[PDB]
Design a protein around this nucleic acid. Structure first.
Ligand SMILES: [Ca+2]
Ligand SMILES: [Ca+2]
Length: 296
DNA sequence: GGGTTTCCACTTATTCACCCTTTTAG
DNA sequence: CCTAAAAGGGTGAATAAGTGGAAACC
């Protein structure tokens, strides 16, 4: 752990990458036949381990471990430590549908705080809570509690609270790219800066507000077969240079994605100076693109 | 102790990120 | 003609969520 993370940036990053967990596990050693585990977790690629360590030192809770060969995770399940998680998301609330999952996390916390999870009465309530959380109930767990159990919950419809949140959220779902377009120009290569944010259609309302909230961009309806998601995209350079860049200069990104923004800004300064029309500039832009994003 | 909590190892599905070329605008 | 802007996408893997196993605590 090194530095601390702004609380609203943390909530925005949690809106993007965090997830709440509730385990209801068969257990022959448990008086009620089941044991439980409640908490919150973030799984990232190895290269962003510094974010996990910064979150850990901000909250002073959580356990960092490997998550396969290429990922690393921060998990909070120590029950007393979950109070920190509750206190944070009460002061700095989530604004995506994940708020719904967090609200269920809170109900489960109340049950385990009353120690009711050690009685069949509490287990049954935890099953009702888990039925509306994330993937919901497995077929086995559903058959183990025959009663009628609702799986539906209230949709979340909230607004971007501030740029600090947007910087956290963008550090997760954002991308700063450079399109090399084969154009009918003299150089034969048009340089195009592209900024975009991706999100499932379950939060269409939040995605469309980005247009209004940022004063630029458009929405693209995408789908890979049976799956749908949205993509907010800005390609006009004046918007990128006047509206997108300054927002993130003043609300600093986190993770390696910050380096991608810094490099993205160099290309922006080149364009701004028209150096992107000279061949020496084009070669500098190619060098930058090669060493950012995957190429880094 | 023994029932309960906490942690580490590891997997799985799809929502992301990040990429491309072609077409149209101005 | 010329450059910027948008359109129209392709797709692998970093995410979100998850289970198995057990040391260890109260
Ligand atoms: Ca997400
Ligand atoms: Ca991410």
């Amino acid at each position: 752990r090194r530095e601390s993370i702004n609380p609203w940036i943390l909530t925005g990053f949690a809106d993007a990458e965090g997830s709440f967990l509730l385990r209801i596990r068969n257990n022959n050693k448990s008086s009620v036949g089941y044991s439980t585990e409640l908490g919150f977790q973030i799984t990232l690629h190895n290269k962003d381990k510094s974010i996990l360590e910064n979150i850990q030192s901000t909250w002073k809770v959580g356990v960092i471990a490997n998550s396969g060969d290429n990922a690393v995770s921060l998990k909070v399940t120590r029950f007393e430590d979950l109070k920190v998680i509750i206190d944070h998301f009460e002061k700095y609330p989530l604004i995506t549908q994940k708020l719904g999952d967090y609200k269920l996390f809170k109900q489960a916390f109340s049950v385990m705080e009353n120690k009711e999870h050690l009685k069949e009465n509490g287990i049954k309530e935890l099953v009702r809570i888990k039925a509306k959380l994330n993937w919901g109930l497995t077929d086995e767990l559903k058959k183990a509690f025959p009663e009628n159990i609702s799986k539906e919950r209230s949709l979340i419809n909230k607004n971007i609270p501030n740029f600090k949140w947007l910087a956290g959220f963008t550090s997760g779902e954002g991308t700063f790219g450079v399109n090399l377009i084969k154009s009918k120009s003299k150089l034969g290569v048009q340089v195009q800066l592209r900024f975009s944010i991706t999100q499932h259609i379950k939060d269409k309302n939040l995605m469309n507000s980005l247009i209004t909230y940022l004063g630029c961009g458009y929405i693209k309806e995408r789908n890979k077969s049976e799956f749908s998601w949205l993509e907010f995209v800005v390609t006009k350079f004046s918007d990128i240079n006047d509206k997108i860049i300054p927002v993130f200069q003043e609300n600093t990104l986190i993770g390696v994605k910050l380096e991608d923004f810094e490099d993205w800004c160099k290309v922006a300064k080149l364009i701004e100076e028209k150096k992107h029309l000279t061949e020496s500039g084009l070669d500098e832009i190619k060098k930058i693109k090669l060493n950012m994003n995957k190429g880094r």
